[PDB]
Design a protein around this ligand. Structure first.
Ligand SMILES: [Mg+2]
Ligand SMILES: [Mg+2]
Ligand SMILES: [Mg+2]
Ligand SMILES: [Mg+2]
Ligand SMILES: [Mg+2]
Ligand SMILES: [Mg+2]
Ligand SMILES: [Mg+2]
Ligand SMILES: [Mg+2]
Lengths: 101, 145, 199, 95, 109, 138
RNA sequence: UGGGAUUAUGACUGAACGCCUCUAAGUCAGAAUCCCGCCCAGGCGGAACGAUACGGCAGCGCCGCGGAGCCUCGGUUGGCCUCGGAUAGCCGGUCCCCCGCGGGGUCCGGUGCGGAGUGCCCUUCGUCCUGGGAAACGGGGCGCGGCCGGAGAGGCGGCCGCCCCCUCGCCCGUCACGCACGCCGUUCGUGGGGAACCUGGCGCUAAACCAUUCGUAGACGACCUGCUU
RNA sequence: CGCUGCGGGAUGAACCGAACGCCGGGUUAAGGCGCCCGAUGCCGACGCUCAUCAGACCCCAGAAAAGGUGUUGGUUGAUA
């Protein structure tokens, strides 16, 4: 139905995009991150969390790993959707909106 | 079809109009005046089979139609042989139709004495300024005319 | 231009036949609320006919075989396909004028819907007989969405009764004004009465 | 064959009051109330008297089987009245 | 300033089951669902209009892209307001389920 | 539940057949689905007619279960059904349903011009009562 | 690894047949069977989000418009909506009571081969001048502002305050409007759909594949990965 | 039949209708008239029948003895 990303997304997560990180310009989420340090974006994003309280039943969260911390040759992170299971929709949005980033 | 009846034309340029019937000539063709003020339709010849008769009538017996009005008078006049027979020509002798005065005189002298009888019926003008057509849910075999 | 049919209280085959004819003749047809459809004969009788169809399948590769649709929408489709030349082109375009749904989606919840009296249950059967609902029957053979589709029709009804009270309010006002200004419209009322309107 | 009419009747005592929305019976009395539907039989139910003294059930133009239902409705009603007026008690023993 | 024609549907050719006689057609008219009410529409001219890639002549106009085939209504195909008709040049078979025009011209009303 | 019965002396209306549009009475019952029938004052001989042909009216008469129809004429004219009958609304709906189909083209025009104005006024009135209620809703 | 409807069977109430009866109407329990679940794959099957090409020439998006030309066909006012019953329904009053001005019920009044009728309803399509009479302030110059839902697949519309502008519906009086000389594809959705030519502002600056490397992968293709920081 | 096509029998050597130059109009036979598929979209008539394997048109492509307070008709003999 709708989705939201945060304001700061480290590069090891952005390498999951960009098959060739070496000769790219790394211009991902550059314009989406400009409606966090803004006035209407604060009105624009927060008009959406209200919808999700009202027209949704299932909440899921995007998370990724920390691959610097390992000995492997790899640097790309792995993404996955995880389900939040609890009481009610409004709770889970508040729980997550705090736990973001 | 009787003198005074009202008729729907449905083929020509003056199409789907409501007119008035005067009489039948000696060639099977009908004389029609959908009076020029209202319908913009003059004295013409029309065919009895490319028309509908309505059940709506008036009394016309007292009226003077001239003698000189004939199939010989409502005749087309073109096809002139004195031509170059060579060029981008051959419909170029003014290319057009222009009205005599005699027609005007005839239309006036008739509608002068037709038209007062029409206004003796109320609302009989809007019926003779309107235009007939078909729409949704109007099947013609059902509707009586 | 476009024809819409509420299927609550109809019979399966008697509806389909009328549809297939119009569809071949250029018309575009839309069948709605296919879970309200009934069938002659009791439940057990009808369940077997469907289960016996589920045991027909190419032994060697049933990735290829008869495809056994479950939903009420797709069953009514699969029926009508039995009444058309679907293995020719004009047959195939006919199918593509038909749209079937289960429940009433948003385009069509604000349109008036037609009925056929010729395929209704109260008309074509005697009341001492048995019949079966196609919604229940799918649930037993693996239709998984009988339960939300219910909630959504409830919400629809909750809003339509709103609309009718407004419409029912306004009729009172339409009727009151008539008897107030009757003295002003007393003339145009008569001619209508003379020619078969308003009497 | 078919026959034109069959009918049968049931009385009510003064203590009890019943009512009907067509083929939906409402009983009430000392020990509470009961509610039961008969919308699957196709009969005509009527209720006549001073404060609805007596009930009759009747049917028109029915076969052998369809006539068999008329007494069965009446039997249920006698049971419901008795229950709301007296109530049922069954005893069971162990062996 | 409006429509002056009745509407119909081209349903198919005269046929048996395993044959055709393509030199006559069948027509389904609107509002007409009984044999008793077809005598109006007898003798009257039909037409099937279509648009082509090239420009063509027009009587009293400029060369638009339209084209026609003319007709004549003949008789009735049985109990239910179906009709038979014939044209000059037999129809194409891509016209099935499309719209033809029934005029009012040979009037006897 | 039921209000109208099939009795001796029950009147009815014929909706389709040779005699459709005509009142008639019932005299005697032959079988499950047929009856002996008469209307003298509507030009309808004595004959048989099924039940699927006719609808039952709320009128009724008084005579025994077979007479010689001089008596039926009395009771008919006695109660003056004909005058009562056109009084009903049911009948006036039939009368009006006639006149619409008989309506010619000039008549069909004058109605157009009238129906128009009638609804201009009624809409323009309804607009006003809404405002009055919206401001008297306080 | 978990459930649902039911078989064979055993029982409830209860007629026909005063009584009796697991059945005629109507109910209950019920299984290595059946269907689904968990589990495998994922449709000529959809969805949400991201970024969108200044190089020695380049190039695109949105808005607003003037002329044209190609190819593919349909069509010839519209109907913006209660739920449901059928051996019964609809409206009004809501006298009387229950659910948070709304809805539910009893009691009343009218209707019912449905006139609060799809056998229906709206909408008028000849234009123009002025010159009298009844009924009257409606709209908008892709106009001035916000409220929303819609969320089942909207691709959707609606109601109060202003800069301005105007006289349309019905009935009569007065004429004009190519009167194109009997005639076929006339008449509207239409600024239609898709490419190519196309006229000013407001905005834009990138990716995939190859070569190369790795081995959680591998017949070759494919797949997992790293390299101006 | 073989030497012989055509309408009907879903299909088909022989079954039913009917035998052939190339075309226009009308009518039929045998079969049939929910949709495939031409035609009942008759306000068709009187009854029977419910099947937890229903029935459905000569040749023809599937079934018997015996049974049943299943239901509708009838005969005979008794009793009120
Ligand atoms: Mg066109
Ligand atoms: Mg179970
Ligand atoms: Mg059992
Ligand atoms: Mg159970
Ligand atoms: Mg021989
Ligand atoms: Mg053959
Ligand atoms: Mg066979
Ligand atoms: Mg056949």
């Amino acid at each position: 139905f709708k989705t939201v990303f945060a304001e700061h997304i480290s590069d090891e997560c952005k390498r999951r995009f960009y098959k060739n990180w070496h000769k790219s310009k790394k211009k991902a989420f550059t314009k989406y991150c400009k409606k966090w340090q803004d006035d209407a974006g604060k009105r624009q994003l927060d008009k959406d969390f209200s919808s999700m309280k009202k027209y949704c039943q299932v909440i899921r969260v995007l998370a990724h790993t920390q691959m610097r911390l390992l000995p492997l040759r790899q640097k790309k992170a792995h993404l996955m959707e995880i389900q939040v299971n609890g009481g009610t929709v409004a709770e889970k949005l508040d729980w997550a909106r705090e736990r973001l980033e | 079809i009787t003198p005074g009846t009202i008729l729907i034309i449905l083929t020509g340029r003056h199409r789907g109009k409501r007119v008035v019937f005067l009489k039948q000539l000696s060639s099977g063709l009908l004389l029609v005046t959908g009076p020029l003020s209202l319908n913009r339709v003059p004295l013409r010849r029309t065919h009895q089979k490319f028309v509908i008769a309505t059940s709506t009538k008036i009394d016309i017996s007292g009226v003077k139609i001239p003698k000189h009005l004939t199939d010989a008078y409502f005749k087309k006049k073109q096809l002139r042989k004195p031509r170059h027979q060579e060029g981008e020509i051959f419909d170029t002798e003014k290319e057009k139709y222009e009205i005599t005065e005699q027609r005007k005189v005839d239309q006036k002298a008739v509608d002068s004495q037709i038209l007062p009888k029409i206004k003796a019926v109320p609302q009989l003008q809007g019926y003779l300024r309107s235009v007939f057509a078909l729409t949704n849910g109007v099947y013609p075999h059902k509707l009586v005319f | 231009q476009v024809l819409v049919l509420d299927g609550r209280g109809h019979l399966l085959g008697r509806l389909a036949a009328i549809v297939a004819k119009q569809v071949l003749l250029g018309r575009k047809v839309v069948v709605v609320r296919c879970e309200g459809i009934n069938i002659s004969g009791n439940f057990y009788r009808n369940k077997l006919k469907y289960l016996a169809f589920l045991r027909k399948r190419m032994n060697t590769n049933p990735s290829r075989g008869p495809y056994h649709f479950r939903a009420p929408s797709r069953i009514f489709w699969r029926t009508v396909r039995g009444m058309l030349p679907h293995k020719t082109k004009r047959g195939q375009a006919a199918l593509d004028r038909l749209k079937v749904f289960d429940g009433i989606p948003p385009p069509y919840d604000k349109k008036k819907r037609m009925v056929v009296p010729a395929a209704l249950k109260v008309v074509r059967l005697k009341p001492t007989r048995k019949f079966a609902y196609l919604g229940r029957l799918a649930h037993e053979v693996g239709w998984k969405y009988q339960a939300v589709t219910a909630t959504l029709e409830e919400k629809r009804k909750e809003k339509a009764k709103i609309h009718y009270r407004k419409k029912k309010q306004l009729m009172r006002l339409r009727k009151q004004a008539e008897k107030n200004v009757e003295k002003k419209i007393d003339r145009f009322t008569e001619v209508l009465k003379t020619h078969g309107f308003l009497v | 064959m078919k026959t034109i009419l069959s009918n049968q009747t049931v009385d009510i005592p003064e203590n009890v009051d019943i009512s009907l929305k067509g083929r939906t019976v409402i009983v009430k009395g000392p020990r509470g109330t009961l509610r039961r539907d008969f919308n699957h039989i196709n009969v005509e139910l009527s209720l006549l008297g001073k404060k609805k003294k007596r009930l009759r059930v009747d049917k028109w133009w029915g076969n052998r089987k369809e006539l068999a239902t008329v007494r069965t409705i009446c039997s249920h009603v006698q049971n419901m009245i008795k229950g709301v007026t007296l109530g049922f008690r069954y005893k069971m023993r162990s062996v | 300033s409006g429509r002056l024609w009745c509407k119909a549907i081209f349903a198919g050719y005269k046929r048996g089951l395993r044959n055709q006689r393509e030199h006559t057609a069948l027509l389904k008219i609107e509002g007409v669902y009984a044999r008793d009410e077809t005598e109006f529409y007898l003798g009257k001219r039909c037409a099937y209009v279509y648009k082509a890639k090239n420009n063509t002549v027009t009587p009293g106009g400029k060369p638009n892209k339209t084209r026609v085939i003319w007709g004549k209504v003949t008789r009735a195909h049985g109990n239910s307001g179906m009709v038979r008709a014939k044209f000059r040049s037999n129809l194409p078979a891509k016209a099935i389920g499309h719209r033809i025009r029934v005029m009012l011209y040979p009037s006897r009303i | 539940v039921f209000r109208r019965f099939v009795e001796v002396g029950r009147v009815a209306y014929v909706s389709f057949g040779p005699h459709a549009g005509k009142l008639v009475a019932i005299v005697d019952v032959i079988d499950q689905n047929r009856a002996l029938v008469d209307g003298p004052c509507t030009r309808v001989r004595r004959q048989a007619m099924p039940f699927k042909c006719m609808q039952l009216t709320d009128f009724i008469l008084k005579f025994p279960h077979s007479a010689r129809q001089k008596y039926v004429r009395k009771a008919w004219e006695k109660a003056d059904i004909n005058t009562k009958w056109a009084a009903t609304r049911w009948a006036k709906k039939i009368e009006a349903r006639e006149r619409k189909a008989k309506m010619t083209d000039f008549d069909r025009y004058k109605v157009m011009k009238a129906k128009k104005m009638r609804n201009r006024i009624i809409k323009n009135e309804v607009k006003k009562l809404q405002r009055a209620a919206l401001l008297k809703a306080s």
